[PDB]
Swiss-Prot record, chains A, B:
Annotated consequence of substituting residue 246 to E: In strain: Isolate BJ04
Ranges of residues in domain Peptidase C30: 1-298
Cytoplasmic-side positions: 1-298
Subunit and partners: Monomer. Homodimer. Only the homodimer shows catalytic activity.
Effect of residue 187 to P: In strain: Isolate BJ02
Function, as annotated: Cleaves the C-terminus of replicase polyprotein at 11 sites. Recognizes substrates containing the core sequence [ILMVF]-Q-|-[SGACN]. May cleave human NLRP1 in lung epithelial cells, thereby activating the NLRP1 inflammasome pathway. Also able to bind an ADP-ribose-1''-phosphate (ADRP). May cleave host ATP6V1G1 thereby modifying host vacuoles intracellular pH.
Compartments, record wording: Host cytoplasm; Host Golgi apparatus
Active site positions: 39, 143
Catalytic activity: TSAVLQ-|-SGFRK-NH2 and SGVTFQ-|-GKFKK the two peptides corresponding to the two self-cleavage sites of the SARS 3C-like proteinase are the two most reactive peptide substrates. The enzyme exhibits a strong preference for substrates containing Gln at P1 position and Leu at P2 position
Name assigned to this protein: 3C-like proteinase nsp5
Domain of life: Viruses
Full-protein interval shown: 3243 to 3540 of 7073
């Protein structure tokens, strides 16, 4: 059972490089706008204490160098939106796909097109951690890279990379420039809080296992929701609300396994262990597939 | 440390649907040729005992329906190459990228663009297992889907999916239509042999760990190659040749950790265990990153 990224073609045609002075990062070109992290305007000395609105009101249009492959795109306007610069260029991207901008919740998944200086290098699937960060060293030096989902023909942009935190996890914003989490776009003390396991996703992955033939771990005993949350919290799992439980409705319907019955199986799995046995050929519980991802891939 | 797929844009523009009668699968459109598994010509009754050259000499050009999105592409020729049909169409793909065809070795990695009836649905990274199969239910119903690597601007096609084996792993061919492994393109008894862990890749992943700060597991004791292979084989690991050892040269150079020293660390890891500790935040040893993948992603 594999982590899949969305095909990245529709996003690749949107990736450009933005340079201000000696700083360069990735930007996203849609219609005649280029979106990038506004800290591209910062010198390393500015970055400790940046006055973004002063720095931005004081920059000329021609001080921005935007490149689509080798081709310079002239900037003809610039404004700020929260933590993003929106740069007007003189050319509409002929490869602009159908898109929207959405803001995602913790636990949800998306694909990241990792880029270096505007050139796509790889695509990764990942989840937004409950602490509003994303794990995995893959975003190191690709500020501006974007996270997205594809809904048949429409690209829903949800993430833009801004920074690496002291523990090496990544922080960024939605495409309206609002951070996920309490973080800021300056070089200062910030810390990812404690993280927890995405309980709903681990439940979804146990349903994926049942769908794929694996039944040995089904519950031997009943649980209540409350007793379930009591045990799960001891293993650093997120507590499960009623509404979380209900999101598992379709997977429950299609398998015949009641949601609280699957909670019971997980509770017994945390307490009693796999003991060398495997689920989906794994010795560990996976928490970066949402219920939606499981329905889609099964 | 994340599994990355190559950006799939260059391959997406090549994916079409091929239909013969009631059978449809994916094909790959390059210049004026469409490549697909030749079992597209089979009825379910043919598939038990197909006479491919008779079935193929007896089919007309117009009995092949090739669709690029909604757009029919007229077939104007057909020949067989080993287990692939090469169909001449009347139109050159305007999106043909720079490409080559290469045949890969067991243990090597590639990206798969999983498609349904010609439409890209997701991209996955994977390795060719030592038993010449590929693991992970992701290829279920996407015969014709292709595996590739990208070398800066050139797509190296290496795999085309043909079949699922009784254990649910996938089997396929290179783009000259030669199977990887002893398998055949008919519905008959075939079995993946026993598989082993890709020792060289697990070593590469331990070097990735060192590159990323993780040093706790470095060897406490010396080993010879022979003593190493003796222990590894007991844990169902592939034995390591001298030439395998030498492929680890660059990772050794860049880290300062001699290859036999890393063999020692793995040997001690297999025997003594992680005991709750993590490498690269994982409690298990990963075997689907090659030495090349590690250099590239670090």
């Amino acid at each position: 059972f594999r982590k899949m990224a969305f095909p990245s073609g529709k996003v690749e045609g949107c990736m450009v490089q933005v340079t201000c002075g000696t700083t360069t990062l990735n930007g996203l070109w849609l219609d005649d706008t280029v979106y990038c992290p506004r800290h591209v305007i910062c010198t390393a000395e500015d970055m400790l204490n940046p006055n973004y609105e002063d720095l931005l009101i004081r920059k000329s249009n021609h001080s921005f160098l935007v490149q689509a492959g080798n081709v310079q795109l002239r900037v003809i306007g610039h404004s700020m939106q929260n933590c993003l610069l929106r740069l007007k260029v003189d050319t509409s991207n002929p490869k602009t796909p159908k898109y929207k901008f959405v803001r995602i919740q913790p636990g949800q998944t998306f694909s990241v097109l990792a880029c270096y200086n505007g050139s796509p290098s790889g695509v990764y699937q990942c989840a937004m951690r409950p602490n509003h960060t994303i794990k995995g060293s893959f975003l190191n030096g690709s500020c501006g890279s974007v996270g997205f989902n594809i809904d048949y023909d429409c690209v829903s942009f949800c993430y833009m990379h801004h920074m690496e935190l002291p523990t090496g996890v990544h922080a960024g914003t939605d495409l309206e420039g609002k951070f996920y989490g309490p973080f800021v776009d300056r070089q200062t003390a910030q810390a990812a809080g404690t993280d927890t396991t995405i309980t709903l996703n681990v439940l979804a992955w146990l349903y994926a296992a049942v769908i794929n033939g694996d039944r040995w771990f089904l519950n031997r005993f009943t649980t209540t929701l409350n007793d379930f949350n009591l045990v799960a919290m001891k293993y650093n799992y997120e507590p499960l609300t009623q509404d979380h439980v209900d999101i598992l409705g379709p997977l429950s319907a299609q398998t015949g396994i009641a949601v609280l019955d699957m909670c019971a199986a997980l509770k017994e799995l945390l307490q009693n262990g796999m003991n060398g046995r495997t689920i989906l050929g794994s010795t560990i519980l996976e928490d970066e597939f949402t219920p939606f991802d499981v329905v889609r891939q099964c």
